[PDB]
Amino acid sequence: GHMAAAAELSLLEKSLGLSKGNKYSAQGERQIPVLQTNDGPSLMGLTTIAAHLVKQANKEYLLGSTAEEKAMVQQWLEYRVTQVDGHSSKNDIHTLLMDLNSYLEDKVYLTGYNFTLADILLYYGLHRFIVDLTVQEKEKYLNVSRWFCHIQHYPGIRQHLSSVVFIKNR
């Protein structure tokens, strides 16, 4: 299964360069993360908390800088929690990879030329699948490999996660 949300949020804090603290509790059968913010409301949900952390880090630009970019970040965060963490990756990961591969053919990052929170979370969420891909599968999903490679080399993102080997065949 996927990274527990408290583990993923701890990893995200380190990637963002947060110092810090923040304790998370968990609620319900699915162990949904809950943050009690100092002198603020409680926040619930992985991507809700993630967007909050980006703001804590004074890195609001990671949420997008235009209406279009902001909506696209949120679209890809939803894809992360509903498709990658949901049934579709469990039942048919290859259709998900085929679609991402087609999508990323002409894009550096998920929203285009700007790196965002969506790249970070899709990277974290896909790591368990990509780390297990064969040589040939990484060549088949060339555009996913290239994007994943960019993210694993992006400053501060990888943290403790295993580096994946990519070999260009060009």
């Binding site: 949900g45 809700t48 967007a51 902001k70 949120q74 894809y79 679609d99």
Partner: protein
């Protein structure tokens, strides 16, 4: 821009109700397609609603389409709204899917339908009661309201499936449903069939 919708697909409700927020920023033409038409070049399986942006990028998420329309109208993102939207996607949607599948495909009624969503409806009602504000994330109808209204509408539009004791939820739902863009969206998606319009989509 070009917004792709299809008859009886429930995700078309919120997007049609929110499309007016783009007025004076960009144009939203409505294209009505079959439920099996694949409009997004990078997606293998058909998805509706879909927005083809002026840039030629696509939004294929109902909540993101609605978010985009609100952002065009000058809405500022807030944490509480994100919280509702994430809950809607991961918690309410599964529960609502089952409830509507029972009602529509299996012909179940009363608590055999409502059972699947009662806890979730109680949560919305309780949240509305505990806040003093008439809407989900504040004082005026906003993004969280349209997304949640849009998900619930196919069920709650029949008064028999809108539980009487949930008075906060009732009043909120009434206030939303009476707004002209909501009425039009309801008429467009469900037409004369009410919840039964969903049957091909639900399965």
């Amino acid at each position: 821009m070009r917004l792709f919708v299809s008859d009886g697909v429930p995700g078309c409700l919120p997007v049609l109700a929110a499309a007016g927020r783009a007025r004076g920023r960009a144009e939203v033409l409505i294209s009505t397609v079959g439920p099996q038409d694949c409009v997004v070049p990078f997606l293998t399986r058909p998805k509706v609603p879909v927005l083809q942006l002026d840039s030629g990028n696509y939004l294929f998420s109902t909540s993101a389409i609605c978010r985009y329309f609100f952002l065009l109208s000058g809405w500022e993102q807030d944490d509480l709204t994100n919280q509702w939207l994430e809950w809607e996607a991961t918690e309410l949607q599964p529960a609502l899917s089952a409830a509507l599948y029972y009602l529509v495909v299996q012909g179940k009624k009363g608590e055999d339908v409502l059972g699947s969503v009662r806890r979730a409806l109680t949560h919305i009602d309780h949240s509305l009661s505990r806040q003093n504000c008439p809407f989900l994330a504040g004082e005026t109808e906003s993004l969280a309201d349209i997304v949640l209204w849009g998900a619930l509408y196919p069920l709650l539009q029949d008064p028999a499936y809108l539980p009487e004791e949930l008075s906060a939820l009732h009043s909120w739902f009434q206030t939303l449903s009476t707004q002209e863009p909501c009425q039009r969206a309801a008429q467009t998606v469900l037409k004369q069939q009410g919840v039964l319009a969903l049957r091909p989509y639900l399965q």
